[PDB]
Ligand binder design. Structure first.
Ligand SMILES: [Mg+2]
Ligand SMILES: [Mg+2]
Ligand SMILES: [Mg+2]
Ligand SMILES: [Mg+2]
Ligand SMILES: [Mg+2]
Ligand SMILES: [Mg+2]
Ligand SMILES: [Mg+2]
Ligand SMILES: [Mg+2]
Ligand SMILES: [Mg+2]
Length: 54
RNA sequence: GGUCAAGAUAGUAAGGGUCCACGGUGGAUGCCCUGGCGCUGGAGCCGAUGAAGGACGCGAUUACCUGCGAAAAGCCCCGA
């Protein structure tokens, strides 16, 4: 399911990128926030790798 | 006074020269430190877990440097 959680931020980042290429990018911060949420969402995966499996 | 003769002698500067006054150019000199030099003393290896050094990228807007690496001027934990 974590891939499902990731690609939603991906698609919003894509359509938001399109909007930036056009005439409307009124909240630039929503960009890097979404990128944050991807990094976090992957970093958490790393913590379930070594945990449990040892 | 006036003609006539003889004689002497000034001022004109086209442009120049010396001096002065005033500027332009140009970056010496003084002052300054963001940069260096040396001695002393510490510390002294890095890499197949990918080194040293690079290439390409990551910004709302990014050409250069800096930082980073598709999780890309950052992500998690701890302390101040
Ligand atoms: Mg003249
Ligand atoms: Mg000059
Ligand atoms: Mg001086
Ligand atoms: Mg110095
Ligand atoms: Mg390298
Ligand atoms: Mg970028
Ligand atoms: Mg660069
Ligand atoms: Mg990846
Ligand atoms: Mg903290």
């Amino acid at each position: 399911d974590f891939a499902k959680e990731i690609d939603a931020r991906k698609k919003e980042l894509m359509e938001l990128r399109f909007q930036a290429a056009a005439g409307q990018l009124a909240q630039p911060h929503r960009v890097r926030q979404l990128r944050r949420e991807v990094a976090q969402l992957n970093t958490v995966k790393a913590e379930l790798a070594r945990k449990g499996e040892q």
